[PDB]
């Protein structure tokens, strides 16, 4: 595993050093690696494939050194040693996609395919180059047990849910109150209502609140809190909750009164905000608790005043909502986010090849179904196969 | 509050209890005893009503929280029986001839009934299942039935004849009918002095009680031979002076009142589930 | 940690090999160690205690080498060993005591006391000793990221719990239908009943189901069920959900229709049974899904027939249940159970000597309080302290 | 099969033993024996798996012998060995799952996997090492014919078994006699019962027995008695012999007169115990008879004289009953017990790999079947097959 980033990151040099015309002391110290990777891998055969539609292919390495001997390089030196690279990063390719297609229940940290394992003897460890990527940097500080981290932008810790909660509610549905959310992505959009307008609420304010649990502890975050939901705001129709009858929802929209958001961990309260909109930090959280009211405004003008009336027909309906949303937060487990790639390499290596439904990950690599029931042993599957694709990504994009 | 849902409710086997709150209820609640009107006969008194509601006070109901009503018999009473307060139990004499008179009155004001219209000129009727009773009741009924078959002929009866019909009733007050399950008949009710009316009945009632003044102790308050539960509501005492009756009831209201209940459709719990 | 292990080891097998009479070449390999213990340990000086009533003490070390020259060993060289015997197995207990006193937050598994942070120098490596036993084996195995696995009999993964569920209720209590539980150490009994008994249910049949997370993952279990739940067979009184009024339950029992027992692991199921009784087994289940139904018997002799009535007076109530029961299973986390007594050790340190409550563990070590909220950070210093109490336990019972 | 303990042996000694920082002469014995290991082993190839979806591996070992000369073993010597002992411990983990999952009907006691035939040749001798686990220790007297044992905690010897027993009956099920029992795992719960209670019984007193006949001979029980079944104790309904009809049994119980426990051994009364509770010894034994008797009690309080008419409506049912329960017990052949988990070794093997089912065992591994009919056949295989899984838990739990 640490000798496949090895192979991988002096190939990228080769085929970025090694130009012509360049002057040989910038490639001095790089050819002595590069023979060195030749010296290691000759005599040894390999087999890579055969699950799914992989097919199979063997590898054999039986190669010359380089020359050692120029001042600058010319078009000889460098068409002899595209000719041994184009080889080596066709292996790399097999390899890759050979690891990121299994998986095991058992262990999933250590190496499944069989090239992977005959890879992790002491006779190849000599092949061994800087480790200077994150995710291979977070490959070893993390196998000596130390802290690691890894930096996201917009990270996918929510799974998908839209759905609501009624506190009060008669089979007429015209006299209605509870909460409805959307937590999709890295953006909580949740907004309260209440029919009457808190005509008859003790000092006519009506509490509401809304907490979400997280799946992982997140660290050193940066959040946008804008007082208004938008995607409740319009009016709709909504089924019932087992799906028997449909119900109207015609909305009219207050400001939030009285804003609390807390951040907590272990039932313990680390940071608190209290009507402070914009951007916040979060330093150390599992758990998000929002918390707002509604209040009956005291003073209203004619115009006004006919929308909430005291008896039974309400055709107006008040409401309130926020929005959350997380800009970049410092995970330890790994995730998907909106800058990076590696999910989407994940899945279309095994959407391609038409790869069963294993023992581990969920049919077809649902990031839904994945961060709901988000256990260990689908945490140490799914390092070991971002880690393998980044690694991919370096050679062949 | 989520009126109309069904909702599951946990709760733990290891918590403390509350306090007493039959003090509580006391102080809130109502009260209503019935008694024949031939009881303040024998009593000889204009202020007796006024005599009981101080003993009343000492048990902790307050003093206008306890009513009296009146009627003449268990015949008379039956014509309409409605119960108004919130507690009540009522007192009957044993008759020997009334036999299913007296479990007549304590069939329908210690159950609850659905009720539907009927209408005997227009349709053809049966009963659907056990619970399934025809309640008539009011100044003279009479009640003959005709049954009919799959291909709506008389079974012992001619469709078009009503002295060919079958009786089930002779001028009663009330009447409660159980006829077969399952066959259309067809009706004979006087209507002009009688009320059918096609009832089913839900859970019984918890808030009435029966004081069965003498006699034996037989209550067939079910419909069917082979049971005839007596329940925890029905009772009997006897008798010699109608004031050793009612000093009984003042010194034991804790004991009767623990074995009724509130009504369960008077509730605000109950607002879609038949009574708000 | 690895040679506080390493010290006990070898003064364990000091007092056991080194007998008066014996031969000289079975213990030509123990005095060899032991003499090396010797020379690392003189000129150093220690401290422990401090914390509660734990008493402070100073240690200091200048001792002599034993003899490599005798035939047979006498009463002159045992009786010069024991009394350097009898001062380290009187400093092995005092840093015990003093490391599983104390906790951290941050990183629990770091050493804690001031003698332990001080015997991790690289100066102390060559105490070494060999790591045999089953909590040293699975500290170093787990510090590598490899996989562990405690084996246990009778687990106490199930918190206390004894409540009930009302799915038909009424103020009166006269017409019910639920679901009653006992979990308890390793041990799940589940009784449903339904007063009607199922008079006017759908082709006579009421169904109940009772499902019950684990807080981890459990591995190849050995489970036995039996189709009766002897604790809710007997007539009793209970409260209502809220403690107002009491309400009574007078039993006769069924058999349970219809059983099927579901292992789950992330919403897949793994494993099932069908109406199969007696001991199972489940290979990988972190989630135990009872279902069971009652149906109302078709025939009955004139004696059961009075039983069960058409109308609302029911005096005898229909009741079903079942028993399970864990004896034996392999976890990965630490926890207790009914064999070892590495629970008692850590507590009965903690009550002994007045110690405050810390930021971690529960107040006074409530083992139902802590499998409850059983977080990755109690995690880490319960393994901390059991595996200190094992080492404490082949010197001092 | 004496090599392949020989091996695991040698390798759970070489994870603990070979440590940094450890002296020379603590390992001298043990690298000896691991040099030894792969020169024997070198040159050769191997095959495992191929049945069910058991994957099929190919094995070739080409290693270097390990060094010699140092004092103190550092972190060069641990990490070259390190990868040498995690390609061994691979091989014999897939020998032993290719060993637990064949069987044979001729002869049983051979090995069936291919690789562990080829490792039962003279070539392969020299790797043996000690021999000093139970198993293996029984494996080794049982092939010389010598007598051998196995100790149990609650050893699984009664299959599961609820049904009754009437020695009089009558259609209206009102008057009935006879017993009921629950034989399960290590534990019997009889229960006799009388509904005339001995009213015209010859000196009101009425007899019961129940015997129980065991699969293998049992030594060295001890048993714990008490007077009272509990599980037959409250009111059921139980349906009649042919599933037609339902009846009652409503019982009140009293203590059960003259008790007798009698342990055979060929007919012959080994062990008898009167009137005897708590616990008690069983030296040799394979049938236990119970023996105990209903006496109606001569004076009765008004209080109890209602209970039991002379005329025929009998409302309270009379019952006597017993339990005992076999805590520990020295048997020869291999059985399931509530310590060990090598029965769940075994099926989670076969489970995993959707193993067919074979002419042998029982399909799914049901104890209850595999008790009922204990063949000759079947048991030559279950020790075959508990040996191999006591193997392949040293190195892998
Ligand atoms: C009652 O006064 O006291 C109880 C405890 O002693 C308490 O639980 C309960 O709240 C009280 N109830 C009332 C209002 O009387
Ligand atoms: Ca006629
Ligand atoms: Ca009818
Ligand atoms: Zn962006
Ligand atoms: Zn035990």
Chains 1, 3, 4 share one sequence.
């Not at chain 1, 799914?52 to 040693?81: K, Q, S």
């Not at chain 1, 999933?108 to 005959?118: E, F, H, N, T, Y």
């Not at chain 1, 800087?130 to 799974?159: A, C, M, V």
């Amino acid at each position: 595993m640490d000798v496949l980033y090895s192979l991988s990151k002096t190939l990228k040099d080769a085929r970025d050093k090694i130009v012509e015309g360049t002057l040989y002391s910038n490639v001095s110290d790089l050819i002595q690696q590069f023979n060195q990777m030749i010296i290691t891998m000759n005599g040894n055969e390999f087999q890579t494939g055969g699950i799914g539609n992989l097919p199979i292919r063997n590898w054999n390495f039986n190669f010359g050194l380089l020359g050692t001997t120029l001042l600058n390089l010319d078009a000889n030196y460098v068409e002899t040693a595209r000719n041994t690279i184009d080889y080596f990063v066709d292996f790399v390719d097999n390899v890759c996609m050979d690891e990121m297609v299994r998986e095991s229940q058992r262990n999933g940290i250590a190496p499944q395919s069989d090239s992977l394992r005959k890879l992790s003897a002491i006779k190849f460890k000599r092949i061994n180059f800087d480790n200077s990527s994150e995710y291979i940097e977070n490959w070893n500080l993390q196998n000596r047990r130390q802290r690691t981290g890894f930096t996201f932008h917009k990270p996918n810790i929510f799974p998908y849910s839209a759905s609501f909660t009624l506190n009060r509610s008669q089979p007429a549905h015209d006299n209605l109150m509870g909460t409805m959310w959307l937590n999709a992505g890295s953006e909580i959009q949740v907004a309260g209502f209440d029919y009457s307008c808190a005509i008859n609420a003790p000092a006519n304010i009506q509490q509401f609140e809304h907490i979400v649990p997280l799946r992982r502890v997140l660290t050193t975050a940066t959040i946008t809190l804008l007082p208004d939901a938008e995607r409740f705001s319009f009016p709709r129709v909504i089924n019932s909750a087992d799906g028997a009858t449909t119900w109207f929802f015609n909305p009219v929209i207050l400001r939030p009164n009285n804003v609390e958001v807390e951040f907590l961990l272990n039932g313990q309260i680390i940071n608190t905000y209290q009507a402070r909109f914009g951007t916040i930090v979060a330093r150390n959280f599992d758990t998000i608790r929002l918390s707002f009211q509604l209040m009956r405004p005291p003073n209203m003008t004619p115009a006004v005043a006919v929308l909430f009336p005291n008896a039974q027909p309400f055709e107006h309906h008040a409401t309130v909502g926020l929005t959350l949303r997380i800009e970049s937060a410092v995970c330890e487990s790994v995730l998907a986010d909106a800058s990076e790639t590696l999910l989407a390499n994940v899945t279309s290596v095994r959407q391609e090849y038409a790869i069963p439904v294993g023992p581990v990950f969920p049919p077809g690599m649902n990031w839904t179904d994945l961060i709901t029931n988000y256990s260990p042993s689908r945490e140490d599957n799914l390092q070991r196969v971002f880690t393998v694709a980044s690694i991919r990504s370096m050679l062949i994009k | 509050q989520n009126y109309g849902i069904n909702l599951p409710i946990t709760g733990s086997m290891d918590t403390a209890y509350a306090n007493s709150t039959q003090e509580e209820t006391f102080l809130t609640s109502t009260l209503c005893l019935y008694y024949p009107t031939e009881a303040a006969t024998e009593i000889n008194d204009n202020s007796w009503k006024d005599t009981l509601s101080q003993l009343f006070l000492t048990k902790g109901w307050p003093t206008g929280s306890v009513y009296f009503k009146e009627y003449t018999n268990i015949a008379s009473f039956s014509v309409d029986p409605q119960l108004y307060c919130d507690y009540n139990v009522v007192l009957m004499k044993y008759d020997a001839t009334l036999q299913l008179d007296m479990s007549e009155l304590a069939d329908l004001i210690l159950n609850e009934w659905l009720c539907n219209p009927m209408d005997i000129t227009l349709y053809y009727y049966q009963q659907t299942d056990e619970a399934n009773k025809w309640i008539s009741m009011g100044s003279s009924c009479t009640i003959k039935v005709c049954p009919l078959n799959t291909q709506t002929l008389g079974i012992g009866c001619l469709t078009t004849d009503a002295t060919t019909f079958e009786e089930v009733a002779t001028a009663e007050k009330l009447v409660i009918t159980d006829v077969v399950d399952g066959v259309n008949h067809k009706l004979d009710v006087t209507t002009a002095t009688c009320t059918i009316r096609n009832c089913k009945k839900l859970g019984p009632r918890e808030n009435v009680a029966v004081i069965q003044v003498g006699g034996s102790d037989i209550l067939d308050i079910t419909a069917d031979p082979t049971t005839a539960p007596q329940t925890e509501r029905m009772m009997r005492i006897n008798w010699k002076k109608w004031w050793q009756v009612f000093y009984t009831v003042v010194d034991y209201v804790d004991q009767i009142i623990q074995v009724m209940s509130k009504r369960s459709r008077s509730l605000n719990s109950a607002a879609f589930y038949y009574r708000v």
